[PDB]
From Swiss-Prot, chain B:
The gene is MCP. Homomultimer. Makes the hexons and eleven out of twelve pentons. Interacts with triplex proteins 1/TRX1 and 2/TRX2; adjacent capsomers are linked together in groups of three by triplexes, heterotrimeric complexes composed of one molecule of TRX1 and two molecules of TRX2. Interacts with scaffold protein; this interaction allows efficient MCP transport to the host nucleus. Interacts with capsid vertex component 2/CVC2. Interacts with the small capsomere-interacting protein/SCP. Self-assembles to form an icosahedral capsid with a T=16 symmetry, about 200 nm in diameter, and consisting of 150 hexons and 12 pentons (total of 162 capsomers). Hexons form the edges and faces of the capsid and are each composed of six MCP molecules. In contrast, one penton is found at each of the 12 vertices. Eleven of the pentons are MCP pentamers, while the last vertex is occupied by the portal complex. It comes from the Viruses. This is Major capsid protein. Belongs to the herpesviridae major capsid protein family. It comes from Epstein-Barr virus (strain B95-8) (HHV-4).
Length: 49, 50, 99
């Protein structure tokens, strides 16, 4: 599964706190990506692995 | 790391091809099935003429 | 450069071009005149970055747009004003195909 969401809000929360991000909000939903390649993301200066 | 979007407009190039809208392939598959349904149904199949 | 208010802010956190369409310097074509001009001006295709829309503003990414009118003339050293506009490096049609 690739990294997907239902809003920009959950994406910009996923970069905020990786260990405490809410995978399921009220109606929206976000999927953290598991993959053989652990691709790195840059949204300004906050980064996750 | 570009935040792309996937709305229905990108889906429109697949959800509007008539191959997705024809039942001829799935009915050709189901009629050519070696073991069809065990039970059938009779009520409200078609419209009967008064 | 003047823009609509509906250009998303998620466009601007990346290092994108100040006009709409990201001018692919060689990823259009090497030595052609209708693919570079195609992938710079003609909005019939979306740009290489964001395939879900053609431009992020139609007041600068078009050929006859405001961002081409008030900025892109041919740069001359002997211009009588002679001031430097920093956004002229993104709009010069000669410089956009100088690479």
């Amino acid at each position: 599964p690739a990294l997907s969401a239902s809003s920009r809000a959950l994406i910009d929360e996923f970069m905020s706190v990786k260990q405490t991000h809410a995978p399921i909000h009220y109606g929206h939903y976000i999927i953290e990506e598991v993959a053989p390649v652990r691709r790195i993301l840059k949204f300004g200066n906050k980064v996750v692995f | 790391n570009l935040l792309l979007a996937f709305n229905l407009q990108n889906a429109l190039k697949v959800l509007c091809h008539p191959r997705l809208h024809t039942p001829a392939h799935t009915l050709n598959s189901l009629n050519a099935a070696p073991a069809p349904r065990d039970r059938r149904e009779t009520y409200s199949l078609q419209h009967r003429r008064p | 450069i003047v823009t609509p208010v509906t250009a998303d802010v998620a466009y601007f956190q990346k290092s994108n071009s100040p006009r709409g369409r990201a001018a692919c310097v060689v990823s259009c074509e090497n030595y052609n005149q209708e693919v570079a001009e195609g992938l710079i001006y003609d909005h019939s295709r979306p740009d290489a970055a964001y395939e879900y829309r053609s431009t992020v503003n139609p007041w600068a990414s078009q050929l006859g747009s405001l961002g081409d009118i008030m900025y892109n003339s041919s740069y001359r050293q002997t211009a009588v004003p002679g001031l430097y506009s920093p956004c002229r490096a993104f709009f010069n049609k000669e410089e956009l195909l100088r690479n």
